Structures are given as C-alpha cells and as structure tokens.
C-alpha cells in the first residue's frame, strides 16, 4: 500500500535521524576527549 | 509515478544509511586515534 509505505518511509527516516543524533552526541564527547588529552599535556 | 518515487525514496534512505555507517566506522577509529596519543603520552 502506498499509504503503508509512506508511513514506513517516515519511520525509517525517523530512525536514521536518531542514528545521526547519537553520532552528534559522540562527536561532542570526542571534543571533550581531545581537549582532555591536550589539557593533560599542558597541566602535567 | 508514486510507486517509482516510493522506490526512489527507499534507495535514497538506503544510501543515507550507508553514509551514516561510514561515519560510524570513522568514529570508532577516532577513538583508537585518541587512545593512541594518550597511550603514547603515557608510555613515552
């Protein structure tokens, strides 16, 4: 059904968006990790 | 055609998902890189 498939496509994109959001959170923490090493190198 | 477009949307999301999977693999290796520098700083 075109209506069922349209809803399936919507939910698939929703899940892809959630995957991107998780990647975004990971990148925010990678920044923290890089800063930490650089700050550990400067403070000791 | 609505059927042709539904199939096009499906393949577009499939390719977006493959792009996210490549980004996920990159993030896994960024972790390795950060650990390496931190482990190189600790071991020498």
């Amino acid at each position: 059904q075109a209506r069922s498939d349209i809803e399936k496509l919507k939910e698939a994109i929703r899940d892809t968006n959630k995957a991107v959001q998780s990647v975004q959170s990971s990148i925010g923490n990678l920044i923290v990790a890089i800063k930490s090493v650089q700050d550990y190198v400067n403070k000791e | 055609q609505a059927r042709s477009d539904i199939e096009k949307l499906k393949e577009a999301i499939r390719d977006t998902n493959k792009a996210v999977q490549s980004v996920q693999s990159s993030i896994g290796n960024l972790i390795v890189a950060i650990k390496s520098v931190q482990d190189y700083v600790n071991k020498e």
């Binding site: 498939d5 995957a19 998780s22 090493v37 | 998902n17 996920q24 972790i31 950060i34 931190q38």
Partner: peptide, 30 residues
C-alpha cells in the same frame, strides 16, 4: 576521566548502529 568519556562514545556509537539496523529493516519491508 578520559576513559569514562571514551566509554560513553562507544555506547553512543552502539546505539547509533542499532538505529540504522532498524531503519534498514523497515526499508526491507517496503
């Protein structure tokens, strides 16, 4: 300190991979 941060990234990466698995399974059913 940094070890905890890297573990968070690993967990968030695992969640991301699972969301893509679900998206692809939905696509397979179209």
């Amino acid at each position: 300190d940094i070890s905890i941060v890297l573990n968070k990234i690993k967990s968030q990466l695992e969640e991301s991979k699972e969301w893509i698995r679900r998206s692809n399974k939905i696509l397979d059913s179209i």
